[PDB]
């Protein structure tokens, strides 16, 4: 059973140079991510090794989803969990304008235009958490079944809250490929920042080899 009310509760429970600031905020949010995951139904019942696999595979996309949705009332910028706003022009002059703009146009602006709500966000993140394609999983079919339950609950919530928007459910799922590509590009940048070492311990562990 996968009630959207519990998923909402999970989101509400965790509510709080530019590359340095982004990194500090990300490290801090990794601790919060663990607390969020434990509130998603059935996750803590998975074998410890699997919980580890799922969080190491999904962490960067889960973090991107949160700061994008947090930033929807923000013009041309991003609200970090630390309370700091990072604007376009600031990211452009640090040499990271391209990736910043992708987040803004592909995620933030589209979340704003449709008024994606916090239950919808939480469900998308729970779907990303329960990724059955994660390597090493002791039972991928158990994770797939939990994924199926989240998106069945999501589809029923959209059809009830927004009955006049029949395409909304698909519209939500169709931000996930953008999220995946932006997550991959962010990882490349983080490995470069690690290399040109001018990064705190939890973020560092997430960038370690398995």
């Amino acid at each position: 059973d996968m009630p959207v009310e519990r998923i909402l509760e999970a989101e509400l429970a965790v509510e709080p140079d530019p590359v340095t600031n982004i990194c500090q905020a990300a490290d801090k949010q990794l601790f919060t991510l663990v607390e969020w995951a434990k509130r998603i139904p059935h996750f803590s019942e998975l074998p410890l090794d699997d919980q580890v696999i799922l969080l190491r595979a999904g962490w960067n996309e889960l973090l991107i989803a949160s700061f994008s949705h947090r930033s929807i009332a923000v013009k041309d910028g991003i609200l970090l969990a630390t309370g700091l706003h990072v604007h376009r022009n600031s990211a452009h002059s640090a040499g990271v304008g391209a990736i910043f703009d992708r987040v803004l146009t592909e995620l933030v602006s589209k979340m704003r235009d449709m008024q994606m709500d916090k239950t919808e966000l939480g469900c998308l993140r729970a779907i990303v958490l329960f990724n059955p394609d994660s390597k090493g999983l002791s039972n991928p079919a158990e994770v797939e079944a939990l994924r199926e339950k989240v998106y069945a609950s999501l589809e029923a919530y959209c059809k009830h809250k927004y009955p006049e928007q029949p395409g909304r459910f698909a519209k939500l799922l169709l931000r996930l490929p953008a999220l995946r590509s932006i997550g991959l590009k962010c990882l490349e940048h983080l490995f470069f920042f690690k290399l040109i070492g001018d990064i705190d311990t939890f973020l560092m562990e997430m960038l370690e080899a398995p």
């Binding site: 601790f31 663990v34 434990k38 410890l48 580890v52 969080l55 190491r56 311990t201 939890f202």
Partner: peptide, 10 residues
Amino acid sequence: HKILHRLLQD
């Protein structure tokens, strides 16, 4: 992966 482990345990 000690930090993630310790946090998942309690």
